[PDB]
Structure 1
Amino acid sequence: EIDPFEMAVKQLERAAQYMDISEEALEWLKKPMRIVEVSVPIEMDDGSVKVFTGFRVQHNWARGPTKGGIRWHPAETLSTVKALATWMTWKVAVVDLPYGGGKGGIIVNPKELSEREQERLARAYIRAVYDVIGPWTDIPAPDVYTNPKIMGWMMDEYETIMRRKGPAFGVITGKPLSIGGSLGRGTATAQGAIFTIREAAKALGIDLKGKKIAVQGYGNAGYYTAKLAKEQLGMTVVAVSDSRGGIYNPDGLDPDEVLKWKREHGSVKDFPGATNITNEELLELEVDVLAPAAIEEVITEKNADNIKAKIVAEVANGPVTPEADDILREKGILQIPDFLCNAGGVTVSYFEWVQNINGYYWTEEEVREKLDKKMTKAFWEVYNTHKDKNIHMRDAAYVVAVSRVYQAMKDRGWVKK
């Protein structure tokens, strides 16, 4: 139940309800512009040939070449890929990139595939979808169960097929630094989230120096968010959690020590000098910034009234339900929309694509400054729409993104109204 695509269409329809958009443009936006389903045959280590199902959905390319990652998950469906491409369209539109929306995926369990089999899978996927991808057509990226090594393999296969007739480095992002990689990719999402948190604090008029932050989820995104907050913003990290449990310390925590203790003991549980807590009561501490960077849909009707965070930074992909959205807005809580808070990753991916296209590569400082400018401008545009239209922050972000895409469509002459 609860079809993925249908939910995206519903959301797109809730967004259009707050803005003036023609019916033909909305109907165009409700349909992906191109969907490609291909068979991906690879040779297994036992010599047998197995055929996998691969997807490549390009939702819209009015603003430019489509952008989106490739997922290798056993539960991947065409509907999920279409919904994620639709969401990626708004994600690149809100942060003002010359990109469209795209997405790819292969129905495969990568846990049971060896390195050689994974390389064969990546190369065969490239051989299957070469005709619909390119540096100026469709730029894939890392995603769940996919890493930069697979990006390098895919880029090498694309370069082999294209015969080095153009910027083969720019066809795919997230590559290793040795081959067309970009500095600052590892901490892109956390850096963008930190920039949006700083801008939100500036908007609310509060100083983050010496304040408290709780991060729910301690993956790369959560750990880097906590570390960057403590370093740059000067905030005090109070509570973190893994999939198992959480810890509490009112005097503060050192993210590096927590990470060191997490990989050593396999979990964040039972950290010395800290009190063991659960995610459900961790979301309820009185803090100024709360950053859910974990399992989706963790804030609902049950716990919406108990949130005491002044700012909620949705690092994860939609951890707050729309009814919880309304409840939090009624309480005077500033929410950064999920596809705006974690837009730093796609922005750094765009920077990598620009570097590959141009043949000139930037330093860490230049990438950080450009990311700062882009994220600050996007957040301030969203907040200004919020204030002007008297709508929710998520609604304002949807309004901005759909307005940009609609203007791009009207300029091309695709829609006459």
Structure 2
Amino acid sequence: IDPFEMAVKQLERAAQYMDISEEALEWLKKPMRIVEVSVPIEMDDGSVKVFTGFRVQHNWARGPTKGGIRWHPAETLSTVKALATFMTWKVAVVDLPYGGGKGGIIVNPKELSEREQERLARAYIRAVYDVIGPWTDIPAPDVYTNPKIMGWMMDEYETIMRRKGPAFGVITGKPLSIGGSLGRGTATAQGAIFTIREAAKALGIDLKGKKIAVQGYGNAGYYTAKLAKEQLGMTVVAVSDSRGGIYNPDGLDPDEVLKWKREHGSVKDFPGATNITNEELLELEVDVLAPAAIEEVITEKNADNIKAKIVAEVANGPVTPEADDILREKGILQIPDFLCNAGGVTVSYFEWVQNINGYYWTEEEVREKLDKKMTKAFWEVYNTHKDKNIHMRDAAYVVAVSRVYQAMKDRGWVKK
């Protein structure tokens, strides 16, 4: 289904749980500014190819818009608009002084050389320069897009801007050598475990010695397992990847699992474990469940079989709304998809703060600031959930849309 229309339907669905005027809802239904540009580069052969670029600024009531740039051959303007609309609420739920944005280029980066990729990155900046800036619109890395491209784009922006202001703050996720931030690799898992600890505290259960299962072993999942087995005494009993999964109640070492997966290409046939499939491992005797691999992994056909006390949605929407309804009545606490993994955007905000201030923090400072941000955001969502008797997703939507609506009213954009 059309991604932008799906985002609009979710906003309309959230509107019924709060007092929002119709004019503000119509304002939030459509992006404030959309830019479509031609991105021309010269290829290695010598010919000029024209690529289609996008940059969508959904809303900037609370501050400059924030969102990554995605390089995908199947990318569409509607998808970019939907992701920018989602980013608005993603930065609103954790109380960032940001609006929502998103960019994209319809390109297959697999077929571009490193010189062609640098040319594309610089041309995109040369084309969208008039709508981006450290206080206007801050891009970020996304699908098929990385810190190297961030460095190239930042250099192009600095060259155009003639070093008048802070050119590091125009983009985030860049290498440490040029305005980069510490804690950027482990941001999402750190935020996820902070929300998990807060959820356990709200449930009033001593979380040390409990069993956790993780779907996927990427940058998210592996670090989620490490940090669970790092500083809160959370016993890992199962991990998984695309190929398969393992489980053993005696205990698992995340570092030994990672090295075995790296030296063998997958976690399958891990020593001292019996291969258990992902769909079987989701239904496991665990006290914290943290799916962190893919989306749509918890559906109607498998929602009623889950037996965990806490589900932490580290992945981007791993639980369907009907599954949300099933898991809610069972008494299972869930963490909304765009609240659990907000550590990445929070640390991008921290990087932007360090760039504009010209002063850079340490790992401990970033971790502690993210601790405060995530705990406050989770408590704000959870109290709304227990006050309005609505699901966690609905409470997070109510909080974020309420913040954006209040900013819009204060600016005078809307009266009612």
* Length-normalised TM-score, structure 2: 0.99
Aligned to 1:187: 186
Shift of 1:80: 0.8
CA separation in 2, counterparts of 1:167 and 1:15? 38
Shift of 1:45: 1.1
Kindly provide the CA deviation profile for residues 182-241 of structure 1, in whole angstroms up to 9, marking residues without a partner as x.
110000000000000000000001121111100101111011111111101211111111
CA separation in 2, counterparts of 1:356 and 1:93? 21
CA separation in 2, counterparts of 1:61 and 1:139? 12
How many residues matched?
416
Shift of 1:356: 0.2
CA separation in 2, counterparts of 1:99 and 1:178? 25
Shift of 1:263: 1.6
Kindly provide the CA deviation profile for residues 239-280 of structure 1, in whole angstroms up to 9, marking residues without a partner as x.
111111111111111111111111211111111111111110
Aligned to 1:412: 411
CA separation in 2, counterparts of 1:333 and 1:140? 36
Question: 1:52 is paired with a residue of what secondary structure?
Answer: strand
Question: 1:18 is paired with a residue of what secondary structure?
Answer: coil
Aligned to 1:223: 222
Kindly provide the CA deviation profile for residues 99-127 of structure 1, in whole angstroms up to 9, marking residues without a partner as x.
00000111111112111111111001111
Kindly provide the CA deviation profile for residues 71-98 of structure 1, in whole angstroms up to 9, marking residues without a partner as x.
1111111111111101100010000000
Shift of 1:43: 1.2
Question: 1:141 is paired with a residue of what secondary structure?
Answer: coil
Question: 1:209 is paired with a residue of what secondary structure?
Answer: coil
Aligned to 2:18: 19
CA separation in 2, counterparts of 1:184 and 1:121? 28
Shift of 1:145: 1.1
Aligned to 2:96: 97
CA separation in 2, counterparts of 1:105 and 1:366? 32
Shift of 1:47: 1.2
Aligned to 2:279: 280
Task: Please show how residues 162-241 of structure 1 align to structure 2 within 5 Å.
Answer: 162-241=161-240
Range with bigger deviation, 257-266 or 15-24:
257-266
CA separation in 1, counterparts of 2:396 and 2:28? 16
CA separation in 2, counterparts of 1:96 and 1:8? 21
Question: 1:222 is paired with a residue of what secondary structure?
Answer: helix
CA separation in 1, counterparts of 2:106 and 2:293? 23
Range with bigger deviation, 107-116 or 60-69:
107-116
Kindly provide the CA deviation profile for residues 159-196 of structure 1, in whole angstroms up to 9, marking residues without a partner as x.
00000010000000001111000110000000000000
CA separation in 2, counterparts of 1:53 and 1:318? 28
Question: 2:408 is paired with a residue of what secondary structure?
Answer: helix
Kindly provide the CA deviation profile for residues 267-295 of structure 1, in whole angstroms up to 9, marking residues without a partner as x.
11111111111110011001111111112
Aligned to 2:115: 116
Aligned to 1:246: 245
Question: 2:286 is paired with a residue of what secondary structure?
Answer: coil
Question: 1:261 is paired with a residue of what secondary structure?
Answer: helix
Aligned to 1:156: 155
Question: 1:305 is paired with a residue of what secondary structure?
Answer: coil
CA separation in 1, counterparts of 2:250 and 2:108? 43
Question: 2:50 is paired with a residue of what secondary structure?
Answer: strand
Question: 2:224 is paired with a residue of what secondary structure?
Answer: helix
Question: 1:195 is paired with a residue of what secondary structure?
Answer: helix
Kindly provide the CA deviation profile for residues 128-160 of structure 1, in whole angstroms up to 9, marking residues without a partner as x.
110110000000011111111111111000000
CA separation in 2, counterparts of 1:241 and 1:111? 27
Range with bigger deviation, 238-247 or 24-33:
238-247
Unpaired runs of at least 5, structure 2: none
Kindly provide the CA deviation profile for residues 292-336 of structure 1, in whole angstroms up to 9, marking residues without a partner as x.
111211111100000011100001111111111000001101010
Are 1:50 and 2:49 an aligned pair? yes
CA separation in 2, counterparts of 1:347 and 1:189? 9
Aligned to 1:80: 79
